[PDB]
């Protein structure tokens, strides 16, 4: 129930309409990631860098296992039963993630029976297919580099240089890993970590993991870029140095009777000045209810807005009244820069501030003039079939709406300042004025 | 017309003055970027990874061509003519970018006649020089790695490992590419994308592109770091998998009668407490007009501020009056931390809070004492030729200004709180007080 004519008269030209869809109903898969490569074919001169690497990796990986042990010790069958006294302090999300962690333990135990086969892999991607119950994929972090670079060069260079190269490669891998798997990882129980962050244990190559696991479509890319594909660590091994990860693949469900409307801001004229309305540019409408949306966390495509979570936020009554027709309640801000948008196109109809930009009609060769009392000009083919604005010549359609658009004025809102220091100064000024008014009282 | 003496007395010590310059007048060049390497010299065992890579790349590249086709179909000669009904909804920037896209089409058509030569390049950087009209450079994404790693190893390792290595390299390249060229790219028509983001199709090596195209200076580095060097995609090929990019090189023009002034904040004493003024640290002056500037989007050098667009913003009247001498209108905030700056140097003169820091004069061996009624202390060589502040001993110059600086007091402003939750709480408190005052009314 937005009043588009008045909003356009105040400089808010309606844009495209998009659909609203959120992730739901995930399917699960399990993978094994090894953080130490197999160096059995250069073991003549690996030196002692492997022991130091193992010590550093054990120091990195111990706190994660310690954090998982808190929920693994206090969960059993009851159908999942938890001891709240032992856990002590938790959030609802942590408890749900602990339930999921308990659910994954049967498959983790099935996978853990192939430890000898896991420890002996010597390729970057290996399929373990002993039984259909535990058909799993193993990814090794630096196996390809060792297989294609260090091994063939063994007989050419002195292998002190080979040892130094291996040490440098391991240190670079650890430097990349520490951003994600270091002390920043305080709560590994949750399942909100994306597959892109998890892939840092495999060198940032999440494409290989996703291509080995499932399929790719346009909705797959939309899910990938909206941070909807996540994973959870369910088992850590401190002797063979590998982890087991459960990957979740959801689907996008469209929410019925809901849409998102975009508004394009255009500067307008008032009292020899240039102004821009301070109004939200994206509006969420659900069952004739108008609200805000935090769209910075969502993905905006040409036809829909995709989020991994509902991001609706409340709106004040004055803003809702301004959006429905009360233009005197819409705030505005002065323009002091020379770089602002000054016209827009909607449904083949042009909305332009012809005071500040030069408008003329190619059909008649005459200029298009705006009165100093008007905010904007609406131009369609009834008055000007083809308009030229600088270097662009554009043909126009017919406007749907009031025939007397340019003969009817609008009521203006109060000017505002949106700077943070200006916000503090305005708060102080209002408080001092209120104190003076109370002093009179 | 800033009152520097009073601002220094309130803790705002004047810093350096910088010039203001913006980009303008770009020149254009055209390059070709190939997203698929030439594997004709290992084609014995490329396997079938090339077909899968082609399918994935086609799925990635189709929407960009679909978005360009909207403007390519509805533009013709009129001197550029556009059909507004077919386009429907657009901004001014999109229309200008569409005009530029139409302008680049002649050179794109000239380049597209060398498709057979483009498809047969087998080096990372190739110059096509058939005629002077279409002297172009071709960059291939992974050609160097294939030429220097996989080909010489074809006779040493089993080439199943070679196939796996090629697959891993292609997947890593796609993982890097998807951040820039995925569904985040909603509007490829515009020309606001930087050369650094475009270089992700060449492995992030924008230095090679810029060195092959033009020259390098200090102004070149300043333009590069201010995000002024941009590019636009003008043609996509879905059969040979390459793109044509137009690169813009602007120049920096200095704006006359404009400068940017910096203020260094120093804590000051009042009523056994420590305070910091809440005032913008960068002020823009243009033709004796004072305004704010959003400097987070600009590049700050030692002598100038460089931006790719004008970033002037308005300022309230109370802040403007505070900056011109009305110190009673300048807000202040309490200091509760032990880590704040407590002195500064300006034109060889020291401004110090000697209540909270220990000041003494080396020339006479005596301490420098500040009264409890004073905010700061100004120290120059008329009173103390050489001052010691902890581990630093500094010789001082002569102060230019009032001889009775330390004998004249200042009027203080109202305290404020700048926390977001505190802002909400203050808003609620003021609203409740206003409601009570209206209830009395």
């Amino acid at each position: 129930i937005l009043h588009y004519e008045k909003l356009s008269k105040i400089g808010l030209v309606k844009g495209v309409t998009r659909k609203y869809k959120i992730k739901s109903n995930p399917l699960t898969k399990d993978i094994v990631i090894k953080m130490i490569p197999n160096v059995s074919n250069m073991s003549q001169c690996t030196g002692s860098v492997m022991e130091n690497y193992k010590t550093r990796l054990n120091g990195i990986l111990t706190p994660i296992k310690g954090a998982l042990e808190i929920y693994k010790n206090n969960t059993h069958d009851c159908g999942v039963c938890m001891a709240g006294v032992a856990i002590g302090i938790a959030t609802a999300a942590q408890i749900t993630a602990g339930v999921a962690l308990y659910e994954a333990m049967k498959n983790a135990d099935n996978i853990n029976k192939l430890k000898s086969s896991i420890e002996s892999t010597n390729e970057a991607v290996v399929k373990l297919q002993e039984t259909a119950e535990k058909t799993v994929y193993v990814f090794t972090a630096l196996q390809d580099y060792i297989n294609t670079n260090l091994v063939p060069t063994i007989d050419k260079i002195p292998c002190k240089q080979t040892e130094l190269s291996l040490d440098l490669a391991l240190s670079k891998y650890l430097s990349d890993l520490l951003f994600v798997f270091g002390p920043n990882l305080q709560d590994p129980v949750s399942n909100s970590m994306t597959i892109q962050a998890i892939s840092q244990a495999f060198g940032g190559n999440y494409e290989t993991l996703l291509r080995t696991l499932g399929y790719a479509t346009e909705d797959f890319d939309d899910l990938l870029e909206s941070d909807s594909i996540t994973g959870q660590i369910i088992y850590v091994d401190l002797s063979s140095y590998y982890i087991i990860v459960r990957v979740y693949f959801p689907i996008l469900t469209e929410i019925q009777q809901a849409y998102i409307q975009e508004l394009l801001p255009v500067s307008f004229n008032n009292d020899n000045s240039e102004w821009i309305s301070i109004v939200p540019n994206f509006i969420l409408v659900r069952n004739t209810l108008i609200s805000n949306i935090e769209i910075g966390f969502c993905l905006i495509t040409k036809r829909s807005v995709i989020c991994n979570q509902d991001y609706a936020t409340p709106m004040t009554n004055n803003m809702r009244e301004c959006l429905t027709g009360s233009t005197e309640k819409c705030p505005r801000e002065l323009v002091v820069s020379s770089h602002v948008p000054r016209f827009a196109l909607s449904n083949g109809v042009l909305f332009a501030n012809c005071i500040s930009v030069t408008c003329q009609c190619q059909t008649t060769g005459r200029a298009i003039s705006q009165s100093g009392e008007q905010t904007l000009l609406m131009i369609d083919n009834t008055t000007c079939p083809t308009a030229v604005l600088g270097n662009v010549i554009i043909s126009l359609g017919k406007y749907l709406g009031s025939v007397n658009y340019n003969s009817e004025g609008i009521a203006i809102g109060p000017p505002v300042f949106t700077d943070k220091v200006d916000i503090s100064s305005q708060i102080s000024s209002m408080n001092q004025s209120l104190q003076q008014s109370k002093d009179y009282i | 017309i800033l009152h520097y003496e009073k601002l220094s007395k309130i803790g705002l010590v004047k810093g350096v003055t910088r010039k203001y310059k913006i980009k303008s007048n770009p020149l254009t060049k055209d390059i070709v970027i190939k997203m698929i390497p030439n594997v004709s010299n290992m084609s014995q065992c490329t396997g079938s990874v090339m077909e899968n890579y082609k399918t994935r790349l086609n799925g990635i590249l189709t929407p960009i061509k679909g978005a360009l086709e909207i403007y390519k179909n509805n533009t013709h000669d009129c001197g550029v003519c556009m059909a507004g009904v077919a386009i429907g909804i657009a901004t001014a920037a999109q229309i200008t970018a569409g005009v530029a896209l139409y302008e680049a089409m002649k050179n794109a058509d000239n380049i597209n006649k060398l498709k057979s030569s483009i498809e047969s390049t087998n080096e990372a950087v190739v110059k096509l020089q058939e005629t002077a009209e279409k002297t172009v450079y071709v960059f291939t994404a992974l050609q160097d790695y294939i030429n220097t790693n996989l080909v010489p190893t074809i006779d040493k390792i089993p080439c199943k490992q070679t196939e796996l290595s090629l697959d891993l390299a292609l997947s890593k390249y796609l993982s890097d590419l998807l951040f820039v060229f995925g569904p985040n790219l909603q509007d490829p028509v515009s020309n606001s994308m930087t050369i650094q983001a475009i270089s992700q199709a060449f492995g992030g090596n924008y230095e090679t592109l810029l060195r092959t195209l033009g020259y390098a200076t200090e102004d070149f580095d300043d333009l590069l770091e201010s995000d002024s060097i941009t590019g636009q995609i003008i043609y996509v090929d879905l059969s040979s998998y390459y793109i044509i990019v137009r690169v813009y090189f602007p120049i920096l023009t200095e704006i006359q009668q404009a400068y940017i002034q910096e203020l260094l904040p120093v804590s000051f004493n009042n009523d056994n407490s420590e305070w910091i003024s809440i005032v913008p640290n960068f002020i823009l002056v243009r033709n004796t007009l004072i305004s704010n500037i959003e400097i987070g989007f600009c590049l700050i050098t030692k002598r100038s501020v460089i931006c790719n667009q004008d970033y002037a913003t308005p300022m309230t009247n109370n802040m403007r009056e505070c900056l011109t001498g009305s110190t009673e209108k300048c807000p202040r905030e309490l200091v509760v931390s032990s880590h704040v700056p407590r002195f500064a140097l300006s034109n060889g003169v020291l401004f110090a809070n000697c209540i909270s820091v220990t000041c003494q004069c080396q020339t006479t061996g005596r301490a420098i004492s500040q009264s409890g009624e004073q905010t700061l202390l100004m120290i120059d060589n008329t009173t103390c030729p050489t001052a010691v502040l902890g581990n630093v001993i500094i010789s001082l110059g002569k102060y230019l200004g009032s001889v009775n600086y330390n004998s004249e007091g200042i009027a203080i402003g109202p305290p404020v709180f700048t926390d977001k939750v505190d802002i909400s709480s203050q808003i609620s408190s003021m609203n409740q007080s206003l409601q009570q005052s209206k209830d009395y009314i």
Partner: antibody
Amino acid sequence: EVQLVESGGGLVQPKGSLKLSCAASGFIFNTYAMHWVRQAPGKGLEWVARIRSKSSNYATYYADSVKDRFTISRDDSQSMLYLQMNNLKTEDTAMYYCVREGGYYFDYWGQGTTLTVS
Amino acid sequence: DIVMSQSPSSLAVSVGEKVTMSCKSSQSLLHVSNQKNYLAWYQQKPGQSPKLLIYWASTRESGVPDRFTGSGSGTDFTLTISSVKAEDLAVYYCQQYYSYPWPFGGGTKLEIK
């Protein structure tokens, strides 16, 4: 198309009063601001008074020499402009023009009417 | 208030000759945001009402012949006629419409030899 016709001028005694009228046609009257401009015999142009439209609350502006003696008004239904002048002096004998303001500059001018004070 | 001055007061030209007159303001007429100059040139023939010639700094009103050219910026503005005809016998005024009280210039009379 755009037409402005002035009327009501003539000869008056000193310290008198007189009202001038301006009839507008060919355009939408209630959209634009209006001006009065006078020219003394043989001298240059001088701005007198300005009235704005309904969207700006009919704000009025006057020159220094006629600030407390002249009154400018408009009637949107009849598309008429009026200038009521009291306490007329010998310095007010001039030709008066009804001016249509387009944009912020003076767009259209009328024929003008003659005031003589003697 | 901004004071407007014109030069010269009078000037005699021959048919086919190029002519130039100057207008000056005490303060800048350039707008901060849209970068436009709020200066206009008007022409008044003997026995006729004034007519608008240039409304921005250099933009010609419809119906004005091509030989009239306005130029300038800041506080200095110039009106130039490439080839004065016999019908250009008139008085030319420069006006600023930036702010109150919107004063006119003194005027420049053109004479034909």
